[PDB]
Amino acid sequence: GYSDRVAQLTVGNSTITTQEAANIVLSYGEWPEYCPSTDATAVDKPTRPDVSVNRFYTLSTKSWKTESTGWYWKFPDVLNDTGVFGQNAQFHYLYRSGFCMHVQCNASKFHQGALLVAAIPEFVIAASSPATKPNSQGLYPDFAHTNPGKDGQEFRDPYVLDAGIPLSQALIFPHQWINLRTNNCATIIMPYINALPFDSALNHSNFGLVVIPISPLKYCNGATTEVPITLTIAPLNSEFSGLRQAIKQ
Amino acid sequence: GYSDRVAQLTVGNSTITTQEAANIVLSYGEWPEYCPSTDATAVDKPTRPDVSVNRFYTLSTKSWKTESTGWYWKFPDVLNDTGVFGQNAQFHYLYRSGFCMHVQCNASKFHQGALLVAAIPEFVIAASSPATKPNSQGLYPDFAHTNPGKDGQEFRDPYVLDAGIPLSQALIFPHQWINLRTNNCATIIMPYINALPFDSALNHSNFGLVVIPISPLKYCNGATTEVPITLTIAPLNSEFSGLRQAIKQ
Amino acid sequence: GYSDRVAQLTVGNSTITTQEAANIVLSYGEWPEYCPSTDATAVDKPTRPDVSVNRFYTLSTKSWKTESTGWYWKFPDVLNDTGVFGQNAQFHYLYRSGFCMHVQCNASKFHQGALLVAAIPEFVIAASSPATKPNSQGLYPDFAHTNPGKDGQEFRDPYVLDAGIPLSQALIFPHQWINLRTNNCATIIMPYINALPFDSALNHSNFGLVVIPISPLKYCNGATTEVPITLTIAPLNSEFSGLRQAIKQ
Amino acid sequence: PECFTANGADYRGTQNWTALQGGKPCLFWNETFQHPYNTLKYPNGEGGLGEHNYCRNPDGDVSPWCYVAEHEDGVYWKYCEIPACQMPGNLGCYKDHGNPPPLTGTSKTSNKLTIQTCISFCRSQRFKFAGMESGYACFCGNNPDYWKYGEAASTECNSVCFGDHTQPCGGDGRIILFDTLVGACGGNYSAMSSVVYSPDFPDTYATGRVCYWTIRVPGASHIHFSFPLFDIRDSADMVELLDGYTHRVLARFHGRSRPPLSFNVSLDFVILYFFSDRINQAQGFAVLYQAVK
Amino acid sequence: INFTNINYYKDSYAASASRQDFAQDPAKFTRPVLDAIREAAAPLQ
Amino acid sequence: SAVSALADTTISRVTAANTAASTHSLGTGRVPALQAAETGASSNSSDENLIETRCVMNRNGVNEASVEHFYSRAGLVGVVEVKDSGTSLDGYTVWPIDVMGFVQQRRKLELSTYMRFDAEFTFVSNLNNSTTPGMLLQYMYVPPGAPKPDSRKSYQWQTATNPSVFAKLSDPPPQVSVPFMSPATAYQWFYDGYPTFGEHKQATNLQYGQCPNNMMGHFAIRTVSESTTGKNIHVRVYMRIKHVRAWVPRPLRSQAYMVKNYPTYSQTITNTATDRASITTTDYEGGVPASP
Amino acid sequence: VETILEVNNTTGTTGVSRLLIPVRAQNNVDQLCASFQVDPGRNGPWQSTMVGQICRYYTQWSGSLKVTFMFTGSFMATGKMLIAYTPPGSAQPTTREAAMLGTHIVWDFGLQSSVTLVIPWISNTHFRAVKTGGVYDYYATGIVTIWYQTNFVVPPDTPTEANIIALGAAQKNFTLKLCKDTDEIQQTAEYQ
Ligand SMILES: CCCCCCCCCCCCCCCCCC(=O)O
Ligand SMILES: CCCCCCCCCCCCCC(=O)O
Ligand SMILES: *[C@@H]1O[C@H](CO)[C@@H](O)[C@H](O)[C@H]1NC(C)=O
Ligand SMILES: *[C@@H]1O[C@H](CO)[C@@H](O)[C@H](O)[C@H]1NC(C)=O
């Protein structure tokens, strides 16, 4: 009737071991599933390259600092140029997949801090601008902020999630904390959420992956200053339809 | 009890229609099959990207001339940089697949000529050199002749298949003629032949694909001079194991 | 499960043999029938001169040229002065009949071109006029264009069928192509279509019979220049009521 | 002609009114501190702004605008319908009602459409006119009657081009028509007065343009060459006024060679030359010649 | 609970539209031929 | 009882054709792609037999493409101005009933050759300034042969047998159900013939295509007034075609109409398709190719 | 019902010639014969089709399309064409090697003179808006390009340029939605 602190996540040829894990958040209680015949609309037979694309891709490592605001990734965009997933995402017009997001941040028992690892469906990034005409560039975020790639994007205003919504209510989304005294990893299994059965992996980013320090990383002199935060994600039940020439963006 | 001249070959999203077809050569009476558990040695789960790689790739068009000697391709090498097959062939160490080679050469009822379309397993290309020391470069074929790519390689001595073996006995291999008065296509379905269940798609070329004009293309003035020869091949039952970084050559 | 290229159409003392026939279009899936008692309104006993009027009348031969626009006939009008059908059509006020339109155009295997043989119910012929007052003569077609007789009428604007409707959608009507590489005849069996069970063969033309060259007749020097197009039609289930003095127009 | 740019970001023309008739007055720039564009955030010029209520385009919008008194429902600015701000190649904003189109010809929808990508599309097919509409639609035609549905206010064609949001590309049912000579890589100019532009003028001139404009007024004595716009800030990219019969350089202009107000020539046959490096492309130039018989 | 398609007048043509008899028979326009041609078969053999 | 009928009154969803799962086919004699368009038959090739398809249990409703739903929509069929001001102090107007005066209704009707239908005619009447003062109007249907009114006071407005609707402008739009009124089994938007016998050698030839089976009389509208009202009333007639039976589908009109009762196109023929630069030029930019 | 696609909707081409896809003997290999977008309601070749005109009376469409190409050359004219449907996201393929990566059919001219290329319903949404252009290229259907798989080979004394007639129609799973008013004919005055 409890959650075991040890966990092993084996997907494909990738395996993730954690010895200080809180639990595994199954987003909205729904495992990732393949598109049923009732919900499908595209007639082409989808490709399900099970083990070549459904596997853990360690994508980015961000150095947690005392004044760090946080980072966000867009799930399809963060894997669109990586591995056989990226190739299928480029060669195919349609794509659907869940994911198993695994954020890793280990620190000594003398460090402190708390990250909020949340998976935000349809994470539309806002721009912070003064009162200006709709002609103004500052009213709308550039592409580097909407699709940060694999490197992610440092939050400008994590208090409002760079979306005008309060960070305090970001816990309405499938979330997990990395409290350094408690756990060093946060696992979120997110099913494919979209008003469409399939969608373009290049145009549309289904989920945002926010890692925001709520309690700032504090430690004493002599502790290891560099405390990294690693994002390992794994597609789950990846389908691809609409084969054509490979399209980058 | 006869072979119908019309044929349609539907593999993946590709479909090949022919209205003047001799038959379909099933090489050695064996359809391409996936590697059984008894014959397999690699323990990794193979990827079988059925419709993304098993499909007709129209790869090369060679202009048949009166003095043309012939052309040869190496089946894995001819697809190693094309489509999702090439990507799987580069990302995976191991590969096995049959193919459905479809050579197309149409000409008017006033043209004449006969091609020999044969699929030669382990088509080791020979070099034609004078009596020289083993130090000599001419004793061994360069890589452009061993792995001609998708463009193929024009035969230097089609009489000996550039292999020291008489072309007249090349009919011991799975073959088909394109006799311009009879048919305009030659289809050969070749199963995976190798002393190994899987093999490197980059190092090892399992089959050679020779198209040699035995009866030279003759026509009269006013007929269409350009008489092309098109090679459309389709992998069949393609497996790939040993995922790693993509390796070109 | 196929259409035999040979066909013989025996109606009355007329027989039409074709050895390169596509099929026989049964217009709207309805064979010509005699007027049932439920649909009839006229009380006089109709005359059904079966074999004297229901027979193939070869009516017109038009020379297909490279710049030819096409020709159209009006089915009752094209037979109103021919044979015992014409006499019954003149002596009787009421008339109803289907027809078996058979267009014939044979050319060598070195000719090319494609006719669109369509049977258009209620083929109201339009006039092509500049913006003018309703007093203007050009706004309305003369009688030679509305009822061309047996000679037919050369299309002025076959692109719009001389009716303001696009020729490209004329395939919504019971149609058949004469593709010179494929067939030399087009047969359309059209039932009597009218909002009335019977109608005047002189005033009302139930169907138009268009023969438009879509792909222009091209050939090389030495081929037979004169490539005729012959219209043989046969009334089917011809009834005539309302006997009186013979009326021409 | 007061404006020689597509967006009106060259207008200094003394119009303190949204429209010449039936509009709203403009708020002074030295008094509009409630808003981003004023004389405090832009001290020295910086967009024709100053101590005046004149319409300006400092933000690179599609048309010269001005701040209006915010009363209606928060509308605190309005585009100015400056009739003299029409680009010398801009034939106007016209209505598009239906299927007999203003420009009967070829069409093109481009999510990267600019004014020049439409003109270049029409010029490649020997069309005289190029009409942008709805920000993405491009229409070509030789129709001298593109006004068959009546003219429209320039502000009715203020939809941003999908490829360059600083340029007007028409609107819903409104088509902005340009003469396809604008931004051509050369051409023959036999006319009294014409405003020859840089290659691909509403956009930035491409890298590697070697263009030759033939300006021969058959009967003129002097040609008054004026440059109302010379955003040619670079070194290799130069604009030369080569002679005619002799093909000799008469005046070479580049970054630190900005042209005089009138480099008049006594030859009735001048060849406007343009050069472009492989890098450092700028907004271009807009020359204006006036032949005096 | 649906309460519609009710005629309040003695004349049947005063009723609402007949929107419950969707029938699709395209063969009279798409395959108006005498010889039924199988899909897998070459039509003109 | 009949409560079972009231239960099955909502429109049931008829779905589109499902796609079956298909595999690869490598053989001879089976050519579902090869067709013969000369036969006049559309291709019977299915998606399953040309590509490897999946199982798509299609639930898209095809019910809206019915002839009833396509036609049961009130469109403008007539604008009748009851002129009672200025030079035209009539106070009445007799309007020839024709549904081919406006392009939107006319083009939809001419999709079919014969149409047998009942109609729901609605009259949306108002002044020039869009206002609807209480002003009594009389919309009298004058069938073919009934005497047409020649004034606002004439005896024909007694409507002892003619159908007539009295409604003020302030009332909601008068709406009536018109049956299938025609001597023929169906109306005929295209009549390849002449109404009368004869030679038809007139310079104008106005009678071609004029079928009196469609001429259903006049709509006489008057202000119920004793003198001039000084106000012109614009009566817009909207016809909703119900109980539709369509026959012989036709190509949709491509040329702009020029007259009401005749197909007549300009000498400047407009192409059905808009012109493009070349037969190999498509204006779809797509995305950036991975490796050109 | 299959109706003629106006694929030769080019400047200068007038009349019935706009309904023909010209095919001729090529001096080079792997060349492009013709291309056209497969958006039924887009101003282009599909306007000439019954499906493309009935689509315009509706806002959203769904289902597979079908283009039956009929070769109208001489019996002695032989040739193989690659007709490829490129799903959305890609522009018109610049080479046949790029086009053969999509849904394609290799058409062999012969006794059967017609080939059918099904444009499969490859869409992210259940329906595509009939309106195209601008942000509505989200509902782009794709591009159909006709390539010379082999040449157009003819014997002597035979025409070297023939025509392919495209016949566009809708598959059995075709569906329309949200009846609207077409934008095909405009009216400025009541027809008198
Ligand atoms: C009280 C007012 C009642 C209104 C009576 C309206 C009667 C309408 C007649 C039915 C309309 C359909 C037939 C129209 C055919 C005419 C078109 C034509 O062929 O020119
Ligand atoms: C005033 C009472 C009218 C009753 C009309 C019958 C309605 C039946 C209710 C069930 C609706 C039918 C569909 C169903 O069975 O769920
Ligand atoms: C516009 O400026 C001119 C400058 O002379 C001035 O006379 C005029 O009153 C101004 N109009 C408005 C509305 O400010
Ligand atoms: C702005 O400048 C004008 C022109 O000199 C002047 O009349 C006005 O008072 C100035 N306003 C302010 C707020 O400085």
Side-chain angles (χ1 to χ4, degrees), chain F residues 97 99 121 123 139 141 165 178 181 187 189 214 216 261:
Chain F
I97 296 184
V99 299
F121 272 76
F123 308 98
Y139 312 85
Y141 173 43
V165 172
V178 175
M181 312 178 313
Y187 299 115
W189 314 129
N214 304 323
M216 291 327 294
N261 300 281

Side-chain angles (χ1 to χ4, degrees), chain E residues 2-3, chain F residues 3 6-7:
Chain E
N2 311 92
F3 198 79
Chain F
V3 297
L6 299 179

